[PDB]
Nucleic acid binder design. Structure first.
Ligand SMILES: [K+]
Ligand SMILES: [Mn+2]
Ligand SMILES: [Mn+2]
Ligand SMILES: [Mn+2]
Ligand SMILES: [Mn+2]
Ligand SMILES: [Mn+2]
Ligand SMILES: [Mn+2]
Length: 136
RNA sequence: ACAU
DNA sequence: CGATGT
């Protein structure tokens, strides 16, 4: 209903899907970019959305921040809740890096705690999430 | 049919 | 038009 402006917004960007994947996190209130991941040569939209949320969790935890995270990805929100990224992406030499990062993110979720609410950004009501890459 |  | 996901 109401945007929680005191929050962190995250999003993936890509060149192809599967394709080159990156993500960033921004202050929802200001749009200030708070972190940006260096592009990974091959991944999927959903793996990147998942990595972005998990990085957000770690970023807020390290800073002792109780802000919620917004993501526009129903899939990634569920994967974080399950602590399991059920990606269909083939595991081969080309996808090894993204799969390592995904597996390491899952490992972090299974060894750490957090209270951070992970909220759905309601794109149909509010427009593009503030971390969007402007490519659609 | 909904979310990317 | 193509793809990734529940
Ligand atoms: K969107
Ligand atoms: Mn997104
Ligand atoms: Mn795994
Ligand atoms: Mn976007
Ligand atoms: Mn368009
Ligand atoms: Mn887009
Ligand atoms: Mn389009």
């Amino acid at each position: 209903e109401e945007i929680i402006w005191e929050s962190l917004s995250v999003d993936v960007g890509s060149q192809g899907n599967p394709g080159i994947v990156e993500y960033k996190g921004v202050d929802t209130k200001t749009g200030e970019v708070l972190f940006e991941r260096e592009p990974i040569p091959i991944g999927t939209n959903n793996m990147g959305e998942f990595l972005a949320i998990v990085h957000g969790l770690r970023y807020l935890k390290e800073r002792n921040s109780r802000k919620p995270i917004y993501s526009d990805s129903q899939t990634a929100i569920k994967w974080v809740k399950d602590k399991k990224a059920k990606s269909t992406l083939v595991r081969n030499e080309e996808t090894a890096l993204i799969w390592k990062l995904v597996d390491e993110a899952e490992e972090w979720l299974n060894t750490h705690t957090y209270e951070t609410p992970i909220l759905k950004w309601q794109t149909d009501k509010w427009g593009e999430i503030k971390a969007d890459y402007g490519r659609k």
